[PDB]
Each structure stands twice: as structure tokens, then as C-alpha cells.
Amino acid sequence: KAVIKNADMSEEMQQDSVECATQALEKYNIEKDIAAHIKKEFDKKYNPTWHCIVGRNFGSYVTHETKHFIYFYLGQVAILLFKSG
């Protein structure tokens, strides 16, 4: 049950975020590894440089390229994926 809280990317790039995060959740138990999976995939499919944060409790402030930002809920975790550089 994905829930988009704040998206800036295209409906297509947005679908790839959810899907990609889904596979990582089906595979990894540790947030850091889930974050890595998603980051590495986006660096590949959409070129560097991306950054990913996964967790249940945190606040952040970042600088990103417009149309390249997404914050959403998947499972009981929240994912912040964005490109800068």
C-alpha cells in the first residue's frame, strides 16, 4: 500500500520509485541496505546523483533538482528519494 506524501517527479519516474522500493523491502531487513538498493537503481536508470533515506523517525532538509523528488510511505517505513548533482 504505497502512499505518496510529496512528489515532484513524473508519474512514470514515480512508479519506478514505489516498485523499486517494493523489491528492496521484499529483500532487505536493514534500512541502510534498502536505501542503497533504491539509490543504486536510480543512479543507473536515471544517471547520478541520487540519495536515499529510509526510516520511521527523522527530519531532513536537502537541496534537490526540481521534478526529481519523492517522499512516500511503503509498508511501515517512509522513503525519501531525491537527486542533487
Partner: peptide, 12 residues
Amino acid sequence: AEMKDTGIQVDR
């Protein structure tokens, strides 16, 4: 090229 500064708070 066209940057934005965004903050997010997570408490689920």
C-alpha cells in the same frame, strides 16, 4: 540547474 530546498518530518 533549477534547485529546490525541501524539508520533511517523519513520525510514523
